[PDB]
From a paper:
Mitoribosomes are specific ribosomes found in mitochondria, which have been shown to be remarkably diverse across eukaryotic lineages. We used cryo-electron microscopy to provide a high-resolution structural characterization of the cauliflower mitoribosome, in translating and maturation states.
We produce a sub-3 Å cryo-EM structure of the cauliflower mitoribosome, which reveals details about rRNA modifications and r-proteins, particularly 4 distinct plant-specific PPR proteins. Given the high local resolution for the different parts of the ribosome (up to 1.8 Å locally, permitting to place ions and solvent molecules), we adopted an unbiased approach to rebuild and identify ribosomal proteins. Beyond these PPR proteins that are specific to plants, it also revealed the presence of a herein identified r-protein. In angiosperms, the 18S rRNA harbors a large extension at the tip of the SSU’s head, rooting from h39 of domain 3’M. Here, we resolve this specific domain to approximate 4 Å (compared to the previously reported 8 Å). Most remarkably, we could identify that the mRNA channel exit harbors mS77, another plant-specific PPR protein. It wraps around the SSU body, rooting from the SSU protuberance, where it is anchored and extends in the back of the SSU, close to the mRNA exit channel, where its PPR domain is located. Finally, the improved resolution reveals the contacts between the LSU’s CP to SSU head via bL31m, mL40 and mL46, and unravels the presence of ATP in mS29, as also found in human mitoribosomes.
Numbering used by the authors:
A (entry chain e): 139 to 384
B (entry chain f): 33 to 204
C (entry chain A): 107 to 205
D (entry chain C): 17 to 266, 280 to 362
E (entry chain U): 2 to 48
F (entry chain D): 70 to 263, 295 to 517
Write the structure that this text describes.
């Protein structure tokens, strides 16, 4: 009989000795609750180095969506981290020695000396405008959960923000490499003249909602369809059918 | 749609501050239950149980009859046409509604203001509160039609004192 | 009731010295057909429920502040029946607690 | 010039080194601020004129002496939320937030003097707005001094904030004599490595971890811990009552169960204890929308700023007179 | 005060909003609510 | 804490550890060939790792100039916590209040182990239950939050979103309930001296009851008493009445509520005329609120402005209304009321708008907890009639709950439709 009491005391001692642990994971969960989507943990530089290794090794399996899901950040931050690690290894190849990283390891080893706010998923900011409808008296039907509708709004805004980030970031990346002019004295005529980019206006020239169809018309008299860079130029100049998020 | 405007007239809803009332309004059949009426009633009571803004529910009848039981003429014409599926669906819908009435999480009150027969008692007597009037007449004449006192009538008649359940179920 | 903590002074034999209640009442039961006291007005000022018997000629300003009206003529027999029912209910509930 | 603004705002809004005389002045100024806060019950002009003017002055100081009232009046919006969120995306403000520089005037001097790049092109516009996707870097001949100054800012930041006030609350003159020995250790890379790997900073870290754990109880954290673990906490009492019935109807078990139940009851029912010692103010990192690699240094914007994460030292109740934010939902509302 | 309703509903809203501490009689009124009768249109009939 | 000598010891040990690691790496390299050009004159003179040498020279010079007291405390630089201004007596009373409750708890558990009869054990078990249900009782809302936190640690995706939002709402509600509960005596104060309050009221109540019984008995024996004994009983009755009046005065302690802000709306000098001249008094109008829907006001008159403000402050918690808000930031719909000749308009607004109001309306709406309202005062701007019109307007708003109860129908927000 007394062995049952001994196992009960073992079950009590395994909890009482681990109360402070439960308070620690409760503090992290409280950070996630009081700021919904806030990841509560701070991402370390070594974890970003591991992300870069997993991407460089197996990019087909360790994609941006998978790395974002695994390290609980946004896909935008994954793209930024990968770009910055590529630049870091290019700088250390040019230097010949690994770069100094004293600040990074001070931040990695003592996150409690600092405040971080790094986010896991996007939560939309709602204009909580009062606007109500009275249902009929014989209405059978279920009201939607406001958290469900908030999730759908947040996910739509997340998809929009991700594709806008992608377009601006790819353009800035090949501006960083050197395929965009951006300085007025680097825009020079070719030996044959200027290429143009001719848009078809009116309702009969439209490529769809966004503008008209475009072709190039080289200075030698020939015309051609758009390149990939020219396609990015077409996509970034379209009007957007939404207000400015963030 | 627009074809369900007759069913919404057959099962009305009256709303109060924290309560809902279902009203049977089929005066041609003396408020006899059809399959769409049972489907509407089941949908209404499920939504009202889910709603935390509703405290309790009601069931009333319009006219001199509370509920004369199930509408068996449609089932008879369906059985005459060979297929037995319509009778089946009506029966598990009706017994599902009776089971919902017996296990309902909020208070439910039935106002029995007239003749109650058959499954009319089956949708009301499993409830928490039941109000009887001086016009209330309860009978179970299922043996005299060739059928049995279903819809939970074998539950509450069998629990009457003595053997009165047998007398009521055999003599009507 | 609204000024129950005000001081009182002994004068003489007088109309006798009485102080206010030490605790505020949770209910007032009123038998004031001729409205000789300000009980309903002070109880409504202090948010205290009022049980009272209402005549057909009660003013709206008094009727609005009576939480539990009992519409009757306040005969001797009806007041006796009212108080007997109140007494029996109170002591039947009080015996259910060991008191 | 700038220390005198402390006399106007009754607190340390200046961020340089104070003399003995300036600390003696700040004692009297903070006494004045305490007596004014008690006096607020009898002030007709407290909300609409006094607090709003002080908050606007603090916001102007925070953003490098900008005309905050004038620029906000340029827009027609009453609340400061979209105005302040737009200010956080400025190029000099972001260069302060990344800790690449120490003050807003340093950032304005660096941007104006054609020495910071955006997407590898030189941008000399101090009020430029950076959207998500922008890449920030320095010049190749300029980045080494920036790396040295960033290391110095971080290591003299830990030595001048995290070491003076955290468990080493020393008097001013003897701590100033003590700082020479602490500065000599930072002269070498080996000294910084050995300071990082030391049981001194590990004890400081553990004490700050426990201190941050205690502050969570102001939100009723331990009551949520009890609510999560209600069934087994009850089961402990069931076990104790069962043992003290069965093995008593006919004692180390009783003492052990009593000690465990009392330890659990004390851990779950003790109220939050806010001690006398002031909380150390920590440097924030803008990781919700700015990704930094401090080796070069370089940074990438990937998101938008947050209205609750702007590192001003203004209280929420005062700043709510300008923002009018429904706080607590985490949104920019 | 400027709040509308009878004693019961006003007191429920005050107690729920944490404005006033709950009085002793509030549970007794909720257990036995004051009586309510339908609208009568005010036309008393000569018997 | 940490001694300053211990800090000097650890920094000298760190500098020594630097030197020991340098000499050990120098030894390891020098034994294996490997000339030490990267050890000498690379960790001694030309490291310059932080650029800290001019700061060292500047600090060294400033440390050999003046004299004071070397161990004299000064005012802190990175001070101004500013939320560290809470009265410490209440907090150090909370500590030993919890300690006394815990010691009583430990005493009942030790008494439960010292019984001999299971009837006695059951009696002390019920005493323990009545103690724990009154002093160590967890609110049921925390049990709901704990269950929801249990679901949340294993949730992912849409469920993680929805549970995070629900627990955010619950945490706000429990923090509000704990901070502003009127039943907790910790949520009250004293005002300037004009379960301890429970027992100090109970002792006065028992004293008053004893004095009332004694006074009734002495009036009873005064009715049949004539002559000089009648006068002696009259004097004894007067002394008893004086004691009862003093004890009744001692129970009238005005309380303020913690977490409330009180603001002056109007202080006015009024006058009355006599044959000796003008008699001048002051009126004070003040409002109070907890930023959570509770608002009140009071008007007082006294000889000075300070005294009028003090009387209004004591009276301001005696007429508190609860105001319903839409989503804790605005009103449900547009409302127009008038009190006498003061017409008030209020319009709800979306969530990044702000408060557009004059100072009286802005103060009352701020203290009630609103964030996004536009308003307009039309006609007379009498501040007291403006206060009364604001309270009339906020109590005439019909919430979606009110409409739902009034019409017996479901009211839905349109964006959830
Ligand atoms: Mg005029």
């Amino acid at each position: 009989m007394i062995k049952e009491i001994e196992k009960d005391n073992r079950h009590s001692r395994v909890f009482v000795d681990g109360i402070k642990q439960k308070m620690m994971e409760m503090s992290v969960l409280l950070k996630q609750v009081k700021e919904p989507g806030a990841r509560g943990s701070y991402l370390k530089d070594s974890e970003k180095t591991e992300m870069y290794r997993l991407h460089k090794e197996n990019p087909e399996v360790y994609t941006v969506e998978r790395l974002a899901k695994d390290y609980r950040i946004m896909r935008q931050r994954v793209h930024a981290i990968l770009f910055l690690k590529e630049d870091e290894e290019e700088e250390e190849r040019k230097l010949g020695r690994p770069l100094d990283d004293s600040v990074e390891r001070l931040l990695d080893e003592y996150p409690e000396f600092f405040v971080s706010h790094d986010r896991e998923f996007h939560v939309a900011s709602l204009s909580y405008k009062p606007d109500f409808k009275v249902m009929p008296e014989g209405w059978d039907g279920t009201i939607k959960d406001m958290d469900e509708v908030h999730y759908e709004i947040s996910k739509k805004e997340d998809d929009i923000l991700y594709e806008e980030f992608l377009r601006r970031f790819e353009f800035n990346k090949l501006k960083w490499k050197g395929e965009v002019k951006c300085h007025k004295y680097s825009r020079r005529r070719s030996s044959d003249g200027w290429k143009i980019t001719v848009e078809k206006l009116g309702p009969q020239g439209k490529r769809g909602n966004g503008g008209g169809w475009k072709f190039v018309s080289l200075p030698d008299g020939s015309s051609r369809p758009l390149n990939e860079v020219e396609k990015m130029y077409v996509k970034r100049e379209a009007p957007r059918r939404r207000r400015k998020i963030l | 749609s627009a074809s369900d405007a007759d069913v919404q007239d057959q099962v009305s809803v009256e709303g109060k501050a924290k309560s809902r009332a279902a009203i049977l309004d089929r005066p041609s059949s003396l408020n006899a239950l059809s399959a769409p009426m049972v489907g509407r009633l089941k949908r209404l009571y499920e939504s009202w149980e889910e709603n935390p803004a509703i405290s309790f529910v009601l069931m009333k009848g319009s006219g001199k009859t509370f509920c004369s039981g199930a509408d068996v003429l449609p089932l008879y014409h369906s059985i005459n046409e060979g297929n037995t599926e319509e009778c089946k669906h009506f029966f598990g819908s009706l017994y599902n509604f009776v089971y919902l009435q017996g296990t309902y999480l909020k208070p439910n009150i039935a106002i029995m203001d007239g003749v109650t027969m058959g499954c009319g008692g089956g949708i009301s007597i499993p409830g928490m509160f039941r109000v009887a009037t001086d016009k209330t007449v309860l009978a179970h004449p299922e043996v005299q039609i060739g059928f049995h006192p279903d819809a939970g009538a074998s539950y509450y008649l069998s629990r009457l004192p003595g053997y009165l359940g047998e007398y009521l179920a055999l003599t009507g | 009731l609204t000024n129950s903590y005000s001081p009182k002074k002994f004068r003489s034999r007088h109309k006798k010295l009485c102080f206010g209640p030490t605790t505020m009442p949770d209910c007032v039961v009123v038998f004031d057909a001729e409205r000789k006291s300000s009980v309903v007005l002070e109880a409504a000022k202090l948010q205290i429920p009022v049980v009272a018997i209402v005549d057909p000629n009660v003013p709206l300003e008094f009727f609005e502040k009576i939480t539990y009206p009992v519409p009757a003529r306040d005969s001797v027999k009806f007041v006796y029946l009212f108080c007997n029912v109140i007494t029996k209910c109170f002591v039947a509930e009080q015996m259910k607690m060991g008191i | 010039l700038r220390f005198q603004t402390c006399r106007l705002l009754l607190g340390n809004v200046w961020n340089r080194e104070l003399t003995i005389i300036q600390r003696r002045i700040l004692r009297r100024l903070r006494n004045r601020k305490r007596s004014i806060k008690k006096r607020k019950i009898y002030s007709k002009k407290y909300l609409t004129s006094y607090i709003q003017l002080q908050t606007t002055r603090k916001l102007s100081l925070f953003y490098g002496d900008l005309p905050i009232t004038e620029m906000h009046r340029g827009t027609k919006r009453t609340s400061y939320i979209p105005f302040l969120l737009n200010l956080e995306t400025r190029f000099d403000v972001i260069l302060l937030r990344l800790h690449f520089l120490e003050t807003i005037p340093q950032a304005r001097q660096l941007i104006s003097h054609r020495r910071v790049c955006v997407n590898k092109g030189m941008v000399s516009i101090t009020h430029l707005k950076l959207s998500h996707g922008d890449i920030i870097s320095f010049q190749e001949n300029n980045a080494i001094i920036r790396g040295e100054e960033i290391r110095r800012s971080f290591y003299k930041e830990i030595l001048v904030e995290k070491i003076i006030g955290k468990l080493l609350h020393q008097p001013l003159r003897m701590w100033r004599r003590s700082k020479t020995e602490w500065f000599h250790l930072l002269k070498t890379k080996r000294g910084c490595r050995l300071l990082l790997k030391s049981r001194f900073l590990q004890q400081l870290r553990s004490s700050m971890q426990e201190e941050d754990l205690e502050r969570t109880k102001k939100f009723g954290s331990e009551k949520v811990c009890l609510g999560s673990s209600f069934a087994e906490h009850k089961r402990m009492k069931r076990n104790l009552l069962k043992s003290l019935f069965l093995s008593k109807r006919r004692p180390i078990v009783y003492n052990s169960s009593l000690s465990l139940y009392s330890n659990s009851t004390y851990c779950f029912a003790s109220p939050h204890k806010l001690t006398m010692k002031r909380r150390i103010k920590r440097i924030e990192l803008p990781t919700h929308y700015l990704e930094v690699n401090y080796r070069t240094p370089k940074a990438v914007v990937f998101y938008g700023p947050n209205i609750g994460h702007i590192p001003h030292d203004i209280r929420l109740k005062d700043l709510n007179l300008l923002l009018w934010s429904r706080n607590g939902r985490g949104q920019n509302i | 005060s400027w709040m509308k309703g009878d004693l019961l509903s006003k007191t429920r809203r005050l107690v729920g909003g944490l404005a006033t501490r709950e009085p002793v009689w509030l549970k007794a009124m909720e257990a036995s609510p004051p009586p309510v009768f339908p609208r009568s249109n005010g036309n008393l009939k000569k018997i | 804490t940490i001694s300053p000598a211990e800090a000097d010891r650890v920094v000298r040990d760190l500098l020594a550890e630097v030197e020991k690691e340098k000499q050990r790496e120098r030894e390891e390299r020098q034994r294996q060939g490997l000339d030490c050009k990267d050890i000498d004159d690379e960790d001694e003179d030309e490291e310059d790792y932080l650029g800290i040498e001019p700061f060292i020279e500047k600090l060294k010079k400033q440390n050999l100039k003046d004299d004071g007291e070397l161990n004299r405390r000064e005012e802190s630089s990175d001070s101004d916590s500013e939320l560290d201004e809470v009265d410490w007596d209440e907090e150090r009373k909370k500590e030993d209040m919890f300690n006394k409750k815990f010691q009583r708890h430990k005493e009942l558990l030790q008494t439960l182990t010292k019984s001999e009869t299971l009837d006695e054990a059951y009696k002390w078990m019920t005493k323990l239950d009545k103690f724990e249900e009154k002093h160590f009782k967890l609110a049921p809302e925390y049990r709901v939050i704990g269950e929801l936190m249990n679901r949340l640690k294993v949730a992912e995706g849409k469920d993680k979103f929805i549970l995070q939002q629900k627990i955010n709402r619950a945490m706000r509600l429990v923090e509000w309930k704990e901070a502003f509960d009127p039943n907790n005596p910790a949520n009250y104060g004293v005002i300037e001296r004009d379960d301890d309050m429970k027992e100090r009221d109970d002792i006065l109540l028992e004293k008053l009851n004893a004095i009332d019984k004694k006074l009734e008995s002495k009036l009873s024996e005064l009715d049949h008493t004539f002559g000089k004994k009648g006068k002696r009983l009259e004097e004894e009755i007067r002394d008893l009445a004086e004691e009862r009046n003093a004890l009744t005065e001692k129970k009238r302690q005005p309380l303020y509520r913690k977490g409330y802000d009180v603001h002056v709306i109007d202080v006015k000098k009024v006058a009355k005329v006599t044959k000796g001249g003008r008699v001048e008094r002051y009126t004070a109008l003040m409002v109070c609120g907890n930023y959570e829907g509770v608002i009140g006001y009071a008007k007082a008159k006294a000889e000075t402005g300070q005294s009028a403000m003090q009387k209004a402050y004591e009276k301001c918690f005696q007429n508190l209304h609860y105001i319903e808000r839409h989503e804790e930031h605005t009103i449900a719909h547009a409302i127009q009321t008038s009190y006498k000749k003061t017409k008030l308009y209020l319009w709800p607004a979306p969530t990044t708008t702000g408060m557009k109001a004059g100072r009286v309306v802005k103060t009352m709406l701020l203290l009630a907890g609103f964030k996004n309202i536009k308003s307009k005062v039309i006609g007379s701007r009498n501040s007291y009639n403006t206060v009364k019109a604001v309270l009339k307007a906020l109590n005439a708003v019909e919430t979606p709950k009110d409409v739902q109860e009034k019409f017996g129908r479901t009211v839905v927000e349109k964006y959830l439709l």
